[PDB]
Design a protein around this ligand. Structure first.
Ligand SMILES: NC(=O)c1ccc[n+]([C@@H]2O[C@H](COP(=O)([O-])OP(=O)(O)OC[C@H]3O[C@@H](n4cnc5c(N)ncnc54)[C@H](OP(=O)(O)O)[C@@H]3O)[C@@H](O)[C@H]2O)c1
Ligand SMILES: NC(=O)c1ccc[n+]([C@@H]2O[C@H](COP(=O)([O-])OP(=O)(O)OC[C@H]3O[C@@H](n4cnc5c(N)ncnc54)[C@H](OP(=O)(O)O)[C@@H]3O)[C@@H](O)[C@H]2O)c1
Ligand SMILES: NC(=O)c1ccc[n+]([C@@H]2O[C@H](COP(=O)([O-])OP(=O)(O)OC[C@H]3O[C@@H](n4cnc5c(N)ncnc54)[C@H](OP(=O)(O)O)[C@@H]3O)[C@@H](O)[C@H]2O)c1
Ligand SMILES: NC(=O)c1ccc[n+]([C@@H]2O[C@H](COP(=O)([O-])OP(=O)(O)OC[C@H]3O[C@@H](n4cnc5c(N)ncnc54)[C@H](OP(=O)(O)O)[C@@H]3O)[C@@H](O)[C@H]2O)c1
Ligand SMILES: COC(=O)C1CCN(C(=O)c2ccc(N(C)Cc3cnc4nc(N)nc(N)c4n3)cc2)CC1
Ligand SMILES: COC(=O)C1CCN(C(=O)c2ccc(N(C)Cc3cnc4nc(N)nc(N)c4n3)cc2)CC1
Ligand SMILES: COC(=O)C1CCN(C(=O)c2ccc(N(C)Cc3cnc4nc(N)nc(N)c4n3)cc2)CC1
Ligand SMILES: COC(=O)C1CCN(C(=O)c2ccc(N(C)Cc3cnc4nc(N)nc(N)c4n3)cc2)CC1
Lengths: 264, 265, 254, 258
């Protein structure tokens, strides 16, 4: 039988590239989305056309809030994402924690608050609950029926040790996700679940600024003097999920073109 | 003329030693507590006896939850009022030590878990963020000519979290976040000359609620002295980092672990 | 056909790296110091699979002068890179794998130990990288390869130092520095410089059981496959980074 | 009883500040120098004037080369530095590995040049510290327990910025990486003898406007005292639970990005 990957925030950009990369290796893919229903469903369509019954889409707000049905908690919503894989395909072999909100939370001058739950939920708390659910399902599976290549990838940030000015909550949340990578790798090793991180520097940079400014930022990357393509990140995620990487756990791989080696 | 330090979770153990260490250097100290009212008030008494009007106590749950007042009171508001208490009482707040911290297992493998999330993440990460925000807002709001000359924020982190304690995921995640806060705040608050640094104990003031051989077993693994640290062995470092001699240090984490993080299984 | 230079290629991890690269279509220059038999045997196997796809070169990578004026380590390193160019006209990949490893205790010979441990693990890699880079720079842009990659074999565990191994540990620390410095300086020439750090691999029960994942040391392939990936064009945005291949061993504490 | 500190490259700048800081705490200080005899001797004079017999000077090339007397090896020269403390004062409590050469060794465009460069940069920054630590430890081990000092401390002067390497400075950067490894390895091995081994890493200090303005805190390089005071604290008994750690003294400079 065919292995299953759950990719959060899979609709576009890096998540899509990760979903596509995994699909190209033969994985059936559960495509999580929050607001990008159209893009997610379009991606599912493409993948199901190449290979029937190889893609589904699930909607979830991964912010640390209760939602409307008692109210539904984030944990419950995370458990149902993993469950959707089991209900549809009877398994979940790979989890990619990719979904992530990203915007300023300045230290210096119902916003703020919202911001805390959105940024911490998507980047840190939801990944925790998702890993918990993922692990619970593997533990609950009889050893003889388990998959042979369980892999969890956390999308971190190569640059957060050189924090982006005004992005504290985001930076804090990636710090937490790094901790989750290490703690989960240790605790889930007995179940042969590998937990690793991939950290982009600058990838698929949006040109929503003066062209010369866009160019200024990307030119700072020592290698190629440009931001990465989506595939340049996703191919690494795909390798780490492959059985050739089966001795790697608890580690974060920078995919940053040497950007973290720079100084002001 | 007397500088003011806010120390969270100041009632006992490391927080108390930090409060005492800062007080010994001339600081007036605002002693935060959650459940340890007796201990906090006793400590305040001792310090006020040595030096009148050099200690106060404030109560606050630093968990990421709304509390009862009218509208519910958010964590952010509660954090702001901690900083405000220093300004109301002494007209200043020069040092913040994010020490308060909950610490217990949140296993990945087999109502509870949810209060756990808000308690562990609130105390270790979210409250420090809001506390730093409030601290910084008050400095920015103070006219340059009236500002203190040695602003210092110390976050109590963990020297061992890169070698995670089995079953302590949320706690470990939260310290990870606090490390991020240290670095991000240091960069952003540098223009205001607010230094933000971390102190990371390994094993300190270990309590023996286990067979003696097991207790001795844990402490013997520390390469230096084969023992856990005293409270002062940690707090003295916090105090140095707050001193003006350490005024070029910001955004860094100092391990106080007797070489424990150098070990392997 | 692209060319890889693998130092200490005769056995264990170096052999697995040489084999892994060869399986991807690389011609491979197999460096050895004392293991002539093993190196030549490996060359034979590879040349049998694919004619003219393997050669062997001998060099002491210790920081000493050797007999011919005496020959310096730098010269010896330059000749290793040169051997690739003389034979195949190119050198696309360099894997700094050769490494001596033994106690240099601080608490109760020592001088050859310093030159051996520091030379193989740090100084020779530096000279090798220098020579490698010089040859790429000297090649006209239109004739250059499209996937230049240098991999340094580091150690996942050296931040948790092995008791009594100071010089070795120092040397890996230097090799890590080399990885970062070289990655930055050679970026304009599109030469990627990265590190792979094993924890416990191909151990010659108590020790291996401490590895959280699988409770065993790794196989050679479990390390070499990662080296091979980093050399592939799919990894072309990775430079200046070290990848631990340690089954979570560096996450442990006493 | 008067404790003794050996400070390498003690003649000027940070080393001098470290020597002065330690002396101000009551230490007798052995001032190592290579080429700066005048400055070293002038510093010794000042310190001996404040407190008779509290300073001496010793000359040594800490480069990884043999010198003229059989030729004298670096190891021997390092052992004699530690020995000089014992001969003069009967003890050596603190070692500060401060001496360091620092200049470009470019990977991209004189063969003898590059070779003395290797031995000079690696010797001073890494190999000599190793031998110095070895000698230092040997002397403590050889001292009967009842006669040992109570606050043994070795400080290695590292670099806060080497993870963001200075372009063209490979050998130097490699050597600091080695010194970091030495700090960690020595801390572990020498823990049983209660010898603490730590690192201090400046970012930009006592620079000889564009460069200094990049430091987030104060937008300037540090003073010598802003670094040396930290070295002094780490050697104090209040820091006696700190070992195997590197303290950045960089005004947040390592937090920056291009
Ligand atoms: N791009 C870079 O240069 C860069 C650099 C460093 C690290 N990274 C990391 O790499 C990963 C992917 O990068 P990216 O640029 O592709 O990310 P992105 O486009 O900014 O976000 C990816 C997806 O996350 C989902 N998301 C955001 N908030 C959510 C929430 N509260 N609940 C549920 N889903 C939410 C969104 O889904 P919907 O659209 O469906 O709403 C979005 O499509 C992220 O984890 C990021 O932190 C990226
Ligand atoms: N001790 C060690 O071996 C060790 C090791 C590594 C790191 N650390 C770090 O060093 C710091 C102090 O260590 P410690 O052992 O002295 O800590 P601790 O005794 O376990 O906790 C300190 C105080 O934190 C307060 N606290 C806990 N949860 C709170 C909440 N939800 N809201 C408000 N206050 C809360 C408690 O105050 P009340 O008693 O008033 O309720 C407690 O007295 C901590 O940040 C810890 O993470 C310690
Ligand atoms: N094995 C592990 O558990 C482990 C763990 C961490 C890191 N590593 C790293 O991974 C790499 C390979 O590991 P390994 O176990 O395969 O290494 P290894 O067997 O101990 O050594 C590999 C080769 O290095 C060569 N070599 C040693 N000293 C030399 C010198 N002075 N001049 C020239 N060549 C010299 C030897 O070549 P000859 O036989 O021809 O003389 C030897 O075959 C090393 O860099 C090591 O540091 C390995
Ligand atoms: N200054 C900074 O911005 C900065 C930044 C990062 C790290 N650091 C570190 O902090 C330490 C001190 O900094 P600094 O700027 O004061 O250093 P420095 O002035 O450049 O050098 C200090 C001393 O090292 C000695 N020295 C150099 N090569 C030697 C050799 N081959 N043998 C014996 N002695 C040798 C010299 O002694 P003589 O004059 O007697 O010949 C020199 O006075 C160094 O370890 C450095 O790496 C400094
Ligand atoms: C108002 O709009 C603008 O013009 C601003 C865009 C943000 N700005 C940047 O400099 C900036 C810094 C880092 C960036 N990245 C690292 C790219 C990027 C893009 N999307 C992301 N998404 C997530 N979730 N996480 C990331 N780290 C992430 N990162 C992008 C822009 C300032 C200008
Ligand atoms: C029942 O079996 C279990 O599940 C194990 C969990 C950990 N156990 C400990 O005894 C224990 C006690 C103290 C420890 N420390 C690291 C000391 C300590 C004590 N209080 C603290 N408080 C806070 N806030 N943060 C800390 N890092 C902290 N650390 C570690 C393990 C019991 C064994
Ligand atoms: C000739 O050497 C000797 O005198 C022996 C002394 C006792 N040894 C070990 O117990 C020991 C400890 C750790 C080991 N490993 C972590 C495996 C290993 C085996 N070979 C290696 N070779 C190199 N070059 N580098 C390594 N890190 C390396 N690592 C292996 C043996 C080392 C071998
Ligand atoms: C012979 O030397 C030369 O060729 C010059 C070339 C131009 N230089 C600089 O721009 C430069 C770059 C960085 C600097 N610093 C980070 C300050 C500094 C000054 N002296 C030092 N000395 C040592 N030993 N180590 C250091 N890290 C060190 N650092 C100083 C000057 C260095 C001096």
């Amino acid at each position: 039988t065919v292995p299953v990957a759950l990719v959060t925030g899979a609709a576009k950009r890096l998540g899509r590239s990760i979903a596509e990369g995994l699909h190209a290796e033969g994985y059936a893919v559960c495509l999580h989305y929050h607001r990008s229903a159209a893009e997610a469903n379009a991606l599912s369509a493409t993948l199901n056309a190449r290979r029937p019954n190889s893609a589904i889409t699930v909607q979830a707000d991964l912010s640390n809030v209760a939602t409307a049905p008692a109210p539904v908690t984030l944990f419950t919503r995370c458990a149902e994402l993993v469950a959707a894989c089991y209900t549809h395909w009877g398994r979940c072999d790979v989890l990619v924690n990719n979904a992530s909100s990203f915007y300023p939370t300045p230290l210096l001058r119902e916003a703020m608050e919202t911001a805390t739950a959105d940024l911490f939920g998507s980047n840190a708390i939801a990944p925790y609950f998702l890993i918990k659910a993922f692990a619970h399902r593997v533990a609950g599976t009889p050893a003889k029926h388990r998959g042979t290549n369980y892999s969890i990838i956390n999308m971190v940030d190569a640059m957060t040790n050189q924090p982006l000015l005004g992005y504290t909550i985001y930076t804090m949340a990636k710090g937490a996700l790094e901790g989750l990578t290490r703690s989960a790798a240790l605790e889930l090793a007995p179940l042969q679940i590998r937990v690793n991180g991939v950290g982009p520097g600058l990838s698929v940079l949006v040109d929503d600024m003066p062209p010369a400014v866009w160019e200024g930022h990307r030119s700072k990357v020592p290698l190629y003097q440009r931001d990465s393509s989506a595939a340049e990140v996703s191919d690494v995620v795909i390798f780490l999920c492959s059985s050739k990487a089966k001795y790697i756990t608890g580690t974060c791989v920078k995919v940053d073109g040497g950007y973290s080696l720079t100084r002001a």
